[PDB]
Amino acid sequence: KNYTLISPCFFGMEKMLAREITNLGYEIIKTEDGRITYKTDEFGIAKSNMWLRCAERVHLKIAEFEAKSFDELFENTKRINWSRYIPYGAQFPISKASSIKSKLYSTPDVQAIVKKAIVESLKKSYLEDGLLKEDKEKYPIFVFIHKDKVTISIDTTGDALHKRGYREKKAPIRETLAAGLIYLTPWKAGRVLVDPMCGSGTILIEAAMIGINMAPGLNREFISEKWRTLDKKIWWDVRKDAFNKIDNESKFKIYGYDIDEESIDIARENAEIAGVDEYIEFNVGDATQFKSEDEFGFIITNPPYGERLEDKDSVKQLYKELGYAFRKLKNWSYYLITSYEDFEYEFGQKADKKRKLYNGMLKTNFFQYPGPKPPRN
Ligand SMILES: Nc1nc2c(ncn2[C@@H]2O[C@H](COP(=O)(O)OP(=O)(O)OP(=O)(O)O)[C@@H](O)[C@H]2O)c(=O)[nH]1
């Protein structure tokens, strides 16, 4: 059997996520702002959770229909054969509802009506006279309404995917965003890579895991691993496969610096937890003094944004100082993410590309500065 899955992502991450899904061998059905819909074989749920670095989670799509009234929402939800997806005794909390530009804007009421519909559907299938028991494993139901089109799905993930298990940290960049940053560059294992304001090390940890082909989900668990409705052998084979795919022969080193000594301590701890401590060296250091004799290196970094009035002036000077230091490097490429709108002006250089991205509550841009190209003829 095949599945239709949906993976939400931050706006601006759709291209990277689509590329990852394509690399897993799956067909993309629909690309929309903040979510990719795709078709997979029976390995799809396990493989998607195991391997996708830019997905915030992996949903199993159950149904899509129009609903302009609560009666219509109820009737359409109830007619779904829920017993096919929710087994006897299973828990089915309606974990979340989102409604955008739709008549059914009250999400808690959407949740209650969907709950009632599913209870009615199951009661009919399971001929349940007494209490419909909900004491076994959990199938969290998600409802998404956009311009009156309702999508109902089941969460296969549980804890948000960005939680790989290594984050034990100030204000770290999201793991999924960090992986997307790496993917937006030409960096490959073996090439010099430095994050000179590395904080708790997220960007470098994500890059190291990409470099040794360590699956993001390798050291965490997923709610669907407990589902009686799945063949447990599939999840098992997918995990074993992922372990075997780790590149154990490759040797490389990438580097992080920060002036916050506690952040370096945390970064080292986090890399050990992630299992990539052998590929990263973290040190206290000042990015404005960064120098190298190597050429053709990469910098990928997340500097302070200077959002507070009290910080704005020092951050502007930092940007100028970074520009000076980075331009003295020999044919390096550098990439910086910041919400500071006028970054290019203070940095002293126009980017090749500027991509709009999101740490959710923050509207950030990724400024890309690939090194000079060879001469023309
Ligand atoms: N090396 C260096 N670090 C600096 C300098 N100025 C500020 N920083 C650090 O640069 C980091 C960039 O800001 P953050 O937003 O905190 O980076 P981060 O939150 O650690 O991002 P993550 O990698 O996900 O943890 C901060 O941890 C600051 O301590 C500097 O002049 N040199």
What kind of experiment solved this structure?
X-ray
Can you say which residues are annotated as belonging to the binding site for GTP? 173, 196, 200, 202, 258-259, 285, 287
* All residues at 6 or more sequence positions from 193 whose CB lies less than 8 Å from its CB, including other chains: 187, 204, 207, 254, 255, 297, 298, 299, 300
Of 188, 309, 294, nearest to 250 (Cα)? 188
Q: For ligand 1, say whether the CB of 362 is within 6 Å of any of its atoms.
A: no
Of 172, 155, 174, nearest to 163 (Cα)? 174
- Same structural domain, 136 and 260: no
Distance 159 CA to ligand 1 centre (A): 27
The full DSSP string for 241-300 is: HHHHHS--S----EEEEES-HHHHHHHHHHHHHHT-GGGEEEEE--GGG---S-BS-EEE
Cα–Cα distance for residue pair 256/2, rounded to 1 Å: 43
Beta-carbon-side half-sphere exposure of residue 264 (alpha carbons within 13 Å): 16
Edge-to-edge strand order for the sheet containing 193-195? 280-284, 254-258, 193-195, 298-301, 333-338, 362-369, 353-359
- Same structural domain, 239 and 259: no
- Same structural domain, 95 and 188: no
Distance 136 CA to ligand 1 centre (A): 45
Of 175, 181, 172, 115, nearest to 143 (Cα)? 115
Q: What is the resolution of this structure in A?
A: 1.7
- Same structural domain, 193 and 126: no
Amino acid, single-letter form, for residue 40: T
- Same structural domain, 205 and 227: no
**The residue to which tokens 């989900």 are assigned:** 217
Residue 139 lies in a domain: yes
Which backbone phi and psi does 258 adopt, to 5 degrees?
Answer: -155, 155
Cα–Cα distance for residue pair 254/205, rounded to 1 Å: 9
- Same structural domain, 143 and 266: no
- Beta partners for residue 35, in sequence order: 8, 32
Cα–Cα distance for residue pair 126/83, rounded to 1 Å: 8
Task: Give me the domain span that covers residue 302.
Answer: 174-213+253-369
Cα–Cα distance for residue pair 194/287, rounded to 1 Å: 10
Can you say which residues are annotated as belonging to the binding site? 173, 196, 200, 202, 258-259, 285, 287
- What are the b/e assignments for 266-298, b being 16+ CB within 10 Å? bbbbbbebbbbbebbebeebebbebeeeeeebb
- Same structural domain, 48 and 21: yes
Atom index in ligand 1 nearest the CA of residue 267 equals 25
Cα–Cα distance for residue pair 344/346, rounded to 1 Å: 6
Please say whether the beta carbons of 38 and 7 come within 8 A.
yes
CA distances to 5, 141, 376 from 60, in Å: 5, 10, 50
- Same structural domain, 45 and 180: no
- Beta partners for residue 66, in sequence order: 149
Helix axes 14-23, 175-183, angle to 10 degrees: 80
- Same structural domain, 341 and 359: yes
Q: For ligand 1, say whether the CB of 173 is within 6 Å of any of its atoms.
A: yes
Q: Which two structure tokens, joined as six digits, stand for 14?
A: 């759709």
**Which DSSP state fits 89?**
T
Please say whether the beta carbons of 174 and 183 come within 8 A.
no
Q: Which two structure tokens, joined as six digits, stand for 79?
A: 């007619």
Residue 62 lies in a domain: yes
Q: For ligand 1, say whether the CB of 364 is within 6 Å of any of its atoms.
A: no
Pseudo-torsion of CA 163, 168, 174, 177, nearest 10°?
A: -70
Residue 167 lies in a domain: no
Distance 198 CA to ligand 1 centre (A): 5
CATH code (residue 300) = 3.40.50.150
Long-range pairs, 133-136, Cβ under 8 A, ≥24? 133/89, 134/89, 134/90, 134/91, 134/92, 135/89, 135/91, 136/87, 136/88, 136/89, 136/90, 136/91, 136/228
Count up the domains in the chain and report the number.
2
Distance 303 CA to ligand 1 centre (A): 6
Cα–Cα distance for residue pair 163/308, rounded to 1 Å: 28
Q: Which two structure tokens, joined as six digits, stand for 279?
A: 């590929």
- Same structural domain, 120 and 191: no
- Same structural domain, 147 and 264: no
- Beta partners for residue 38, in sequence order: 5, 28
Residue 164 lies in a domain: no
Q: For ligand 1, say whether the CB of 225 is within 6 Å of any of its atoms.
A: no
Distance 140 CA to ligand 1 centre (A): 37
Residue 165 lies in a domain: no
Q: For ligand 1, say whether the CB of 170 is within 6 Å of any of its atoms.
A: yes
Q: For ligand 1, say whether the CB of 196 is within 6 Å of any of its atoms.
A: yes
Residue 168 lies in a domain: no
CATH code (residue 119) = 3.30.2130.30
Q: For ligand 1, say whether the CB of 176 is within 6 Å of any of its atoms.
A: no
Residue 356 lies in a domain: yes
Residue 375 lies in a domain: no
SS (H, E, C) 339-360: CCCCHHHHHCCCCCEEEEEEEC
- Same structural domain, 209 and 355: yes
Segments in the chain forming alpha helices (H):
14-23, 44-51, 70-78, 107-125, 175-183, 202-211, 232-245, 261-274, 309-327, 343-347
CA distances to 21, 34, 61, 103, 133 from 13, in Å: 12, 8, 20, 29, 40
Distance 253 CA to ligand 1 centre (A): 20
> What totals of helices (H) and strands (E) does the chain contain, helices first?
10, 14
